[PDB]
Every structure is written in structure tokens, then in C-alpha cells.
Copies of this chain bind each other. A is one copy, B any other.
Amino acid sequence: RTSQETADVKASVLLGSRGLDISHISQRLESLSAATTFEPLEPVKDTD
């Protein structure tokens, strides 16, 4: 229905009228997909 070629811009006109930035939230969601917090510390499936 909507081309992605205009999406984040039109969403930012609509939601920026209410004080939201789509770009800082996307650039956070990029860091939230690069932040390797992980525990290689305990023994996978010791059991049965």
C-alpha cells in the first residue's frame, strides 16, 4: 500500500507532530542489535 521509498519520512511527519524521532529510535535499535551482552559461563544440558 505504502512504498518504503517514503515510509520513515511520512511516519516522522505524523509522529514528529507528537514529539517522536524515528531516526534516534532506529539508531538505538541498531545499537540494540550490535550490543553483544551474553554469558558464555554455564554448562549447556548436563542432564539425563
Write the residues of chain A forming the contact surface with B, with a CB cutoff of 8 angstroms.
5-6, 8-10, 12-13, 16-17, 19, 21-24, 26-27
Contact = CB atoms under 8 A, between A and B. Distances in A.
Contact of A8 (B9, B21, B24, B27): B9
10 contacts: A6-B26, A6-B27, A8-B12, A9-B12, A9-B22, A9-B23, A10-B23, A12-B16, A13-B16, A17-B19
- In the complex, the count of this chain's copies comes to 2
A20 to B, nearest CB: 8
Given A10-B21, A12-B13, A16-B16, 18 more contacts: A5-B8, A6-B8, A6-B26, A6-B27, A8-B9, A8-B12, A9-B9, A9-B12, A9-B21, A9-B22, A9-B23, A10-B23, A12-B12, A13-B16, A13-B21, A13-B23, A16-B17, A17-B19
